[PDB]
Amino acid sequence: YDYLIKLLALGDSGVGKTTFLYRYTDNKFNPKFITTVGIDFREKRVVYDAFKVHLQLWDTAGLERFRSLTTAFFRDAMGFLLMFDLTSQQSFLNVRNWMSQLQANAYCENPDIVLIGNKADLPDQREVNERQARELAEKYGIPYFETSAATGQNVEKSVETLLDLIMKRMEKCV
Ligand SMILES: Nc1nc2c(ncn2[C@@H]2O[C@H](COP(=O)(O)OP(=O)(O)O)[C@@H](O)[C@H]2O)c(=O)[nH]1
Ligand SMILES: [Mg+2]
């Protein structure tokens, strides 16, 4: 091959990232890198003044590892499959709220994004107005697709669009 293009699936839990990726991939190669993170507490008896206070002092573990894991996830990423759930308004707003926080880098250093409304095969459950979603896409001048990981609707179409953005970005930047 000639190129290694790194893509990321972002979005809330239960949105369909893992199912979308497996739908598109159509193979079983999926190497995993897991770590443990945790919380805990300790206790101490303490007499205030009269009063017998019971102290719980909480703490966290494994955060350093988690950061390396996060960095490793974003390292050299060229496209984000930014997805939400058409049946979940909360998934849509979280995306919009997330986007409003991104800081622009130089044109070439900016990663491409495709906005993805997943679970298009359950119209009876839809919460996300189409017009609202297209406007978010319009706002940040990005493509928008309504996809289904179960049917395969626009799954291949959305990914190849992201590739095309990435590839056309290179042509200009090289
Ligand atoms: N009907 C329907 N269900 C989906 C679709 N994509 C994912 N799901 C279901 O939604 C649940 C959450 O999906 P999952 O990929 O595990 O969410 P993730 O946390 O984003 O990775 C799973 O039980 C999937 O079967 C879709 O396009 N249509
Ligand atoms: Mg998942």
Side-chain angles (χ1 to χ4, degrees):
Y1 74 83
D2 300 314
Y3 286 105
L4 182 55
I5 280 70
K6 184 172 173 187
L7 303 181
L8 298 183
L10 305 178
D12 286 6
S13 304
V15 128
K17 307 174 292 291
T18 318
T19 326
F20 182 108
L21 288 186
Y22 173 73
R23 178 68 210 201
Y24 170 74
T25 286
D26 211 38
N27 69 241
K28 287 148 208 288
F29 174 83
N30 184 37
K32 295 160 197 63
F33 306 82
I34 61 98
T35 196
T36 286
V37 294
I39 65 169
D40 63 289
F41 66 92
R42 289 161 210 277
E43 296 167 271
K44 186 146 190 272
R45 272 177 145 180
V46 47
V47 213
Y48 184 72
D49 298 8
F51 294 96
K52 294 160 188 179
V53 182
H54 194 247
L55 277 179
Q56 289 194 168
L57 307 97
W58 296 61
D59 202 10
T60 60
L63 285 174
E64 198 78 285
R65 281 165 171 173
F66 182 72
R67 280 176 215 201
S68 73
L69 207 66
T70 296
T71 289
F73 189 75
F74 287 94
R75 214 207 323 275
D76 317 326
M78 300 161 84
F80 304 151
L81 306 147
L82 195 50
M83 41 205 296
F84 65 95
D85 191 335
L86 285 170
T87 74
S88 162
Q89 192 69 189
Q90 286 177 12
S91 64
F92 178 80
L93 292 172
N94 285 170
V95 167
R96 183 201 62 186
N97 279 26
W98 188 76
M99 294 192 81
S100 58
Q101 281 164 317
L102 304 171
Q103 302 187 317
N105 286 61
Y107 186 96
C108 294
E109 280 153 32
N110 283 330
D112 283 284
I113 121 101
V114 163
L115 186 77
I116 287 160
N118 191 45
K119 303 190 192 195
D121 54 287
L122 311 171
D124 291 332
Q125 305 203 42
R126 176 191 261 251
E127 292 182 24
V128 188
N129 207 100
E130 185 167 12
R131 276 180 179 148
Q132 188 172 203
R134 277 176 188 180
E135 279 182 28
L136 180 64
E138 250 144 47
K139 184 183 193 181
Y140 294 94
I142 54 164
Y144 170 59
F145 292 98
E146 301 212 347
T147 63
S148 172
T151 310
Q153 176 191 119
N154 290 330
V155 168
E156 203 199 79
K157 196 190 182 176
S158 45
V159 181
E160 269 164 357
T161 298
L162 192 60
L163 174 62
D164 183 59
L165 285 182
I166 294 168
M167 289 279 89
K168 283 172 159 202
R169 200 165 98 262
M170 286 187 59
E171 288 174 26
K172 286 147 216 178
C173 292
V174 63

PDB file of all heavy atoms in Angstrom, residues 11-20 83 85 118-122 147-151, ligand 1:
ATOM      1  N   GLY A  11     -18.211  10.214  19.830  1.00  0.00           N
ATOM      2  CA  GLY A  11     -19.642  10.279  20.141  1.00  0.00           C
ATOM      3  C   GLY A  11     -19.983   9.600  21.448  1.00  0.00           C
ATOM      4  O   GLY A  11     -19.212   8.768  21.943  1.00  0.00           O
ATOM      5  N   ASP A  12     -21.143   9.958  21.997  1.00  0.00           N
ATOM      6  CA  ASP A  12     -21.678   9.368  23.240  1.00  0.00           C
ATOM      7  C   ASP A  12     -21.707   7.832  23.262  1.00  0.00           C
ATOM      8  O   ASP A  12     -21.584   7.179  22.223  1.00  0.00           O
ATOM      9  CB  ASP A  12     -23.101   9.883  23.499  1.00  0.00           C
ATOM     10  CG  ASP A  12     -23.138  11.319  23.992  1.00  0.00           C
ATOM     11  OD1 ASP A  12     -22.079  11.985  24.032  1.00  0.00           O
ATOM     12  OD2 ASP A  12     -24.251  11.782  24.337  1.00  0.00           O
ATOM     13  N   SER A  13     -21.887   7.268  24.452  1.00  0.00           N
ATOM     14  CA  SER A  13     -22.075   5.828  24.596  1.00  0.00           C
ATOM     15  C   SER A  13     -23.408   5.395  24.002  1.00  0.00           C
ATOM     16  O   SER A  13     -24.403   6.117  24.089  1.00  0.00           O
ATOM     17  CB  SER A  13     -22.017   5.427  26.059  1.00  0.00           C
ATOM     18  OG  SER A  13     -20.795   5.850  26.629  1.00  0.00           O
ATOM     19  N   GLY A  14     -23.415   4.221  23.382  1.00  0.00           N
ATOM     20  CA  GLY A  14     -24.645   3.643  22.854  1.00  0.00           C
ATOM     21  C   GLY A  14     -25.110   4.291  21.570  1.00  0.00           C
ATOM     22  O   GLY A  14     -26.193   4.002  21.077  1.00  0.00           O
ATOM     23  N   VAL A  15     -24.280   5.175  21.038  1.00  0.00           N
ATOM     24  CA  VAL A  15     -24.557   5.876  19.790  1.00  0.00           C
ATOM     25  C   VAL A  15     -24.411   4.931  18.597  1.00  0.00           C
ATOM     26  O   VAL A  15     -25.150   5.045  17.616  1.00  0.00           O
ATOM     27  CB  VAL A  15     -23.664   7.166  19.691  1.00  0.00           C
ATOM     28  CG1 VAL A  15     -22.891   7.259  18.393  1.00  0.00           C
ATOM     29  CG2 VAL A  15     -24.500   8.400  19.930  1.00  0.00           C
ATOM     30  N   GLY A  16     -23.476   3.985  18.699  1.00  0.00           N
ATOM     31  CA  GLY A  16     -23.302   2.959  17.676  1.00  0.00           C
ATOM     32  C   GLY A  16     -21.930   2.924  17.028  1.00  0.00           C
ATOM     33  O   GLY A  16     -21.766   2.326  15.968  1.00  0.00           O
ATOM     34  N   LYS A  17     -20.942   3.545  17.674  1.00  0.00           N
ATOM     35  CA  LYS A  17     -19.585   3.650  17.125  1.00  0.00           C
ATOM     36  C   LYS A  17     -18.985   2.283  16.807  1.00  0.00           C
ATOM     37  O   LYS A  17     -18.529   2.051  15.682  1.00  0.00           O
ATOM     38  CB  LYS A  17     -18.660   4.403  18.083  1.00  0.00           C
ATOM     39  CG  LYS A  17     -19.155   5.765  18.526  1.00  0.00           C
ATOM     40  CD  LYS A  17     -18.244   6.350  19.591  1.00  0.00           C
ATOM     41  CE  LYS A  17     -18.315   5.569  20.901  1.00  0.00           C
ATOM     42  NZ  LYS A  17     -19.621   5.711  21.595  1.00  0.00           N
ATOM     43  N   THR A  18     -18.999   1.387  17.797  1.00  0.00           N
ATOM     44  CA  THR A  18     -18.435   0.048  17.657  1.00  0.00           C
ATOM     45  C   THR A  18     -19.190  -0.768  16.609  1.00  0.00           C
ATOM     46  O   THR A  18     -18.573  -1.496  15.838  1.00  0.00           O
ATOM     47  CB  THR A  18     -18.407  -0.725  19.009  1.00  0.00           C
ATOM     48  OG1 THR A  18     -17.975   0.143  20.069  1.00  0.00           O
ATOM     49  CG2 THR A  18     -17.482  -1.931  18.937  1.00  0.00           C
ATOM     50  N   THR A  19     -20.515  -0.643  16.579  1.00  0.00           N
ATOM     51  CA  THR A  19     -21.319  -1.385  15.601  1.00  0.00           C
ATOM     52  C   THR A  19     -21.137  -0.832  14.186  1.00  0.00           C
ATOM     53  O   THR A  19     -21.139  -1.592  13.222  1.00  0.00           O
ATOM     54  CB  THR A  19     -22.831  -1.402  15.946  1.00  0.00           C
ATOM     55  OG1 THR A  19     -23.018  -1.422  17.365  1.00  0.00           O
ATOM     56  CG2 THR A  19     -23.492  -2.633  15.337  1.00  0.00           C
ATOM     57  N   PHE A  20     -20.992   0.487  14.078  1.00  0.00           N
ATOM     58  CA  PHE A  20     -20.757   1.172  12.804  1.00  0.00           C
ATOM     59  C   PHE A  20     -19.427   0.724  12.212  1.00  0.00           C
ATOM     60  O   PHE A  20     -19.345   0.410  11.027  1.00  0.00           O
ATOM     61  CB  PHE A  20     -20.763   2.690  13.041  1.00  0.00           C
ATOM     62  CG  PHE A  20     -20.579   3.540  11.797  1.00  0.00           C
ATOM     63  CD1 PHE A  20     -21.647   4.257  11.271  1.00  0.00           C
ATOM     64  CD2 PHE A  20     -19.324   3.688  11.201  1.00  0.00           C
ATOM     65  CE1 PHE A  20     -21.477   5.073  10.146  1.00  0.00           C
ATOM     66  CE2 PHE A  20     -19.147   4.496  10.076  1.00  0.00           C
ATOM     67  CZ  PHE A  20     -20.221   5.187   9.549  1.00  0.00           C
ATOM     68  N   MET A  83     -20.313  11.054  15.424  1.00  0.00           N
ATOM     69  CA  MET A  83     -21.662  10.509  15.353  1.00  0.00           C
ATOM     70  C   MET A  83     -22.542  10.800  16.546  1.00  0.00           C
ATOM     71  O   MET A  83     -22.071  11.000  17.664  1.00  0.00           O
ATOM     72  CB  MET A  83     -21.666   9.009  15.001  1.00  0.00           C
ATOM     73  CG  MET A  83     -20.610   8.151  15.662  1.00  0.00           C
ATOM     74  SD  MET A  83     -20.248   6.669  14.690  1.00  0.00           S
ATOM     75  CE  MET A  83     -21.845   5.833  14.755  1.00  0.00           C
ATOM     76  N   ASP A  85     -26.981   9.954  17.786  1.00  0.00           N
ATOM     77  CA  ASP A  85     -28.101   9.046  17.622  1.00  0.00           C
ATOM     78  C   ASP A  85     -29.338   9.844  17.263  1.00  0.00           C
ATOM     79  O   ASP A  85     -29.787  10.710  18.023  1.00  0.00           O
ATOM     80  CB  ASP A  85     -28.310   8.251  18.912  1.00  0.00           C
ATOM     81  CG  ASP A  85     -29.287   7.102  18.757  1.00  0.00           C
ATOM     82  OD1 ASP A  85     -30.160   7.134  17.861  1.00  0.00           O
ATOM     83  OD2 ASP A  85     -29.187   6.160  19.569  1.00  0.00           O
ATOM     84  N   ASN A 118     -26.674   8.443  13.350  1.00  0.00           N
ATOM     85  CA  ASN A 118     -26.809   6.996  13.308  1.00  0.00           C
ATOM     86  C   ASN A 118     -28.211   6.523  13.695  1.00  0.00           C
ATOM     87  O   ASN A 118     -29.017   7.295  14.232  1.00  0.00           O
ATOM     88  CB  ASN A 118     -25.762   6.351  14.215  1.00  0.00           C
ATOM     89  CG  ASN A 118     -25.666   4.855  14.022  1.00  0.00           C
ATOM     90  OD1 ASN A 118     -25.651   4.363  12.894  1.00  0.00           O
ATOM     91  ND2 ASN A 118     -25.598   4.118  15.132  1.00  0.00           N
ATOM     92  N   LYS A 119     -28.482   5.247  13.412  1.00  0.00           N
ATOM     93  CA  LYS A 119     -29.752   4.589  13.732  1.00  0.00           C
ATOM     94  C   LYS A 119     -30.912   5.161  12.918  1.00  0.00           C
ATOM     95  O   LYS A 119     -32.008   5.392  13.436  1.00  0.00           O
ATOM     96  CB  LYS A 119     -30.042   4.625  15.241  1.00  0.00           C
ATOM     97  CG  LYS A 119     -28.949   3.995  16.094  1.00  0.00           C
ATOM     98  CD  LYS A 119     -29.383   3.824  17.532  1.00  0.00           C
ATOM     99  CE  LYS A 119     -28.201   3.466  18.413  1.00  0.00           C
ATOM    100  NZ  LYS A 119     -28.644   2.944  19.733  1.00  0.00           N
ATOM    101  N   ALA A 120     -30.658   5.370  11.630  1.00  0.00           N
ATOM    102  CA  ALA A 120     -31.669   5.899  10.717  1.00  0.00           C
ATOM    103  C   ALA A 120     -32.781   4.894  10.423  1.00  0.00           C
ATOM    104  O   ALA A 120     -33.777   5.243   9.803  1.00  0.00           O
ATOM    105  CB  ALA A 120     -31.024   6.379   9.422  1.00  0.00           C
ATOM    106  N   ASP A 121     -32.618   3.657  10.881  1.00  0.00           N
ATOM    107  CA  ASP A 121     -33.590   2.591  10.611  1.00  0.00           C
ATOM    108  C   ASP A 121     -34.702   2.496  11.663  1.00  0.00           C
ATOM    109  O   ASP A 121     -35.476   1.539  11.651  1.00  0.00           O
ATOM    110  CB  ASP A 121     -32.876   1.248  10.509  1.00  0.00           C
ATOM    111  CG  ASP A 121     -32.033   0.964  11.722  1.00  0.00           C
ATOM    112  OD1 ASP A 121     -30.970   1.600  11.854  1.00  0.00           O
ATOM    113  OD2 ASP A 121     -32.436   0.128  12.551  1.00  0.00           O
ATOM    114  N   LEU A 122     -34.776   3.468  12.571  1.00  0.00           N
ATOM    115  CA  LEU A 122     -35.848   3.505  13.565  1.00  0.00           C
ATOM    116  C   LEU A 122     -36.563   4.856  13.533  1.00  0.00           C
ATOM    117  O   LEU A 122     -36.437   5.647  14.470  1.00  0.00           O
ATOM    118  CB  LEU A 122     -35.313   3.218  14.974  1.00  0.00           C
ATOM    119  CG  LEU A 122     -34.393   2.017  15.233  1.00  0.00           C
ATOM    120  CD1 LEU A 122     -33.832   2.070  16.651  1.00  0.00           C
ATOM    121  CD2 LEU A 122     -35.086   0.682  14.972  1.00  0.00           C
ATOM    122  N   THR A 147     -27.075   7.626   8.702  1.00  0.00           N
ATOM    123  CA  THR A 147     -26.555   6.273   8.527  1.00  0.00           C
ATOM    124  C   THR A 147     -27.244   5.248   9.428  1.00  0.00           C
ATOM    125  O   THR A 147     -27.889   5.603  10.420  1.00  0.00           O
ATOM    126  CB  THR A 147     -25.047   6.220   8.865  1.00  0.00           C
ATOM    127  OG1 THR A 147     -24.864   6.547  10.248  1.00  0.00           O
ATOM    128  CG2 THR A 147     -24.252   7.198   8.010  1.00  0.00           C
ATOM    129  N   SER A 148     -27.082   3.973   9.080  1.00  0.00           N
ATOM    130  CA  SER A 148     -27.558   2.873   9.906  1.00  0.00           C
ATOM    131  C   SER A 148     -26.545   1.735   9.927  1.00  0.00           C
ATOM    132  O   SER A 148     -26.274   1.124   8.900  1.00  0.00           O
ATOM    133  CB  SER A 148     -28.910   2.361   9.396  1.00  0.00           C
ATOM    134  OG  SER A 148     -29.297   1.179  10.077  1.00  0.00           O
ATOM    135  N   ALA A 149     -25.997   1.445  11.102  1.00  0.00           N
ATOM    136  CA  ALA A 149     -25.054   0.335  11.264  1.00  0.00           C
ATOM    137  C   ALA A 149     -25.712  -1.041  11.078  1.00  0.00           C
ATOM    138  O   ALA A 149     -25.041  -2.013  10.726  1.00  0.00           O
ATOM    139  CB  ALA A 149     -24.380   0.417  12.624  1.00  0.00           C
ATOM    140  N   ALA A 150     -27.019  -1.114  11.322  1.00  0.00           N
ATOM    141  CA  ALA A 150     -27.771  -2.357  11.170  1.00  0.00           C
ATOM    142  C   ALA A 150     -28.102  -2.652   9.697  1.00  0.00           C
ATOM    143  O   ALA A 150     -27.938  -3.788   9.242  1.00  0.00           O
ATOM    144  CB  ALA A 150     -29.042  -2.325  12.032  1.00  0.00           C
ATOM    145  N   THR A 151     -28.552  -1.631   8.961  1.00  0.00           N
ATOM    146  CA  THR A 151     -28.875  -1.765   7.532  1.00  0.00           C
ATOM    147  C   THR A 151     -27.633  -1.637   6.661  1.00  0.00           C
ATOM    148  O   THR A 151     -27.496  -2.335   5.657  1.00  0.00           O
ATOM    149  CB  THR A 151     -29.880  -0.692   7.068  1.00  0.00           C
ATOM    150  OG1 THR A 151     -30.998  -0.670   7.956  1.00  0.00           O
ATOM    151  CG2 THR A 151     -30.381  -0.985   5.652  1.00  0.00           C
TER     152      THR A 151
HETATM  153  N1  LIG B   1     -31.343  -0.046  15.174  1.00  0.00           N
HETATM  154  C1  LIG B   1     -30.025   0.268  15.216  1.00  0.00           C
HETATM  155  N2  LIG B   1     -29.325  -0.056  16.334  1.00  0.00           N
HETATM  156  C2  LIG B   1     -28.008   0.239  16.442  1.00  0.00           C
HETATM  157  C3  LIG B   1     -27.338   0.914  15.326  1.00  0.00           C
HETATM  158  N3  LIG B   1     -26.057   1.077  15.695  1.00  0.00           N
HETATM  159  C4  LIG B   1     -25.914   0.555  16.939  1.00  0.00           C
HETATM  160  N4  LIG B   1     -27.082   0.059  17.380  1.00  0.00           N
HETATM  161  C5  LIG B   1     -27.326  -0.593  18.681  1.00  0.00           C
HETATM  162  O1  LIG B   1     -27.159   0.352  19.745  1.00  0.00           O
HETATM  163  C6  LIG B   1     -26.442  -0.260  20.828  1.00  0.00           C
HETATM  164  C7  LIG B   1     -25.190   0.547  21.144  1.00  0.00           C
HETATM  165  O2  LIG B   1     -24.295   0.402  20.038  1.00  0.00           O
HETATM  166  P1  LIG B   1     -22.719   0.442  20.283  1.00  0.00           P
HETATM  167  O3  LIG B   1     -22.009   0.374  18.956  1.00  0.00           O
HETATM  168  O4  LIG B   1     -22.285  -0.665  21.211  1.00  0.00           O
HETATM  169  O5  LIG B   1     -22.535   1.880  20.978  1.00  0.00           O
HETATM  170  P2  LIG B   1     -21.112   2.603  21.172  1.00  0.00           P
HETATM  171  O6  LIG B   1     -20.967   2.799  22.659  1.00  0.00           O
HETATM  172  O7  LIG B   1     -21.140   3.922  20.443  1.00  0.00           O
HETATM  173  O8  LIG B   1     -19.964   1.797  20.610  1.00  0.00           O
HETATM  174  C8  LIG B   1     -26.052  -1.671  20.387  1.00  0.00           C
HETATM  175  O9  LIG B   1     -26.860  -2.619  21.084  1.00  0.00           O
HETATM  176  C9  LIG B   1     -26.323  -1.715  18.898  1.00  0.00           C
HETATM  177  O10 LIG B   1     -26.850  -2.972  18.475  1.00  0.00           O
HETATM  178  C10 LIG B   1     -28.163   1.237  14.139  1.00  0.00           C
HETATM  179  O11 LIG B   1     -27.662   1.813  13.147  1.00  0.00           O
HETATM  180  N5  LIG B   1     -29.460   0.890  14.162  1.00  0.00           N
END
